[PDB]
């Protein structure tokens, strides 16, 4: 049908690639600003749409609405459902003992857990 101004169009949702930094708790108040949420990855074809757009700005790294509310917890998405392996696995990229990488981005064509407060860009979604 239609989307907003500056919104792309795929499959069953508008998107918005936020090229402004913020932390992971600013992207998801802009989102949700929006009358949106931070993205949600269903399934491998929804994958496939972002990674084309991700990996033509991977000096960026793009906040999705995947997180944990502590280290040892589950990746939850924002509406509250589990988080299951069937389009990505989230890589340990942490370098040193650390209790605070527990927000996700994607960035260039994998997804990695970062510390929440950190700037990056984000992607909203609505359905």
């Given at each position: 049908?239609?989307?907003?101004?500056?919104?792309?169009?795929?499959?069953?949702?508008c998107y918005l690639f936020s090229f402004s930094g913020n932390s992971w708790?600013?992207?998801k108040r802009h989102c949700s600003?929006?009358?949106a949420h931070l993205l949600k990855?269903?399934?491998?074809?929804?994958?496939?749409?972002?990674?084309?757009?991700?990996?033509?700005?991977?000096?960026?790294?793009?906040?999705?609405?995947?997180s944990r509310n502590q280290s040892e917890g589950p990746w939850?998405?924002?509406?509250?459902s589990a988080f299951f392996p069937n389009?990505?696995?989230v890589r340990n990229a942490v370098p040193q003992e650390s209790l605070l990488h527990n927000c996700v981005?994607?960035?260039?064509?994998?997804?990695?857990?970062?510390?929440?407060?950190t700037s990056s860009?984000?992607?909203?979604?609505?359905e």
């Open positions: 049908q239609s989307c907003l101004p500056n919104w792309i169009m795929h499959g069953k949702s708790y600013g992207s600003q929006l009358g990855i269903d399934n491998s074809k929804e994958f496939e749409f972002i990674e084309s757009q991700t990996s033509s700005h991977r000096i960026n790294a793009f906040w999705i609405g995947l939850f998405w924002e509406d509250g389009s990505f696995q981005w994607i960035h260039g064509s994998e997804v990695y857990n970062q510390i929440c407060n860009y984000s992607i909203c979604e609505k």
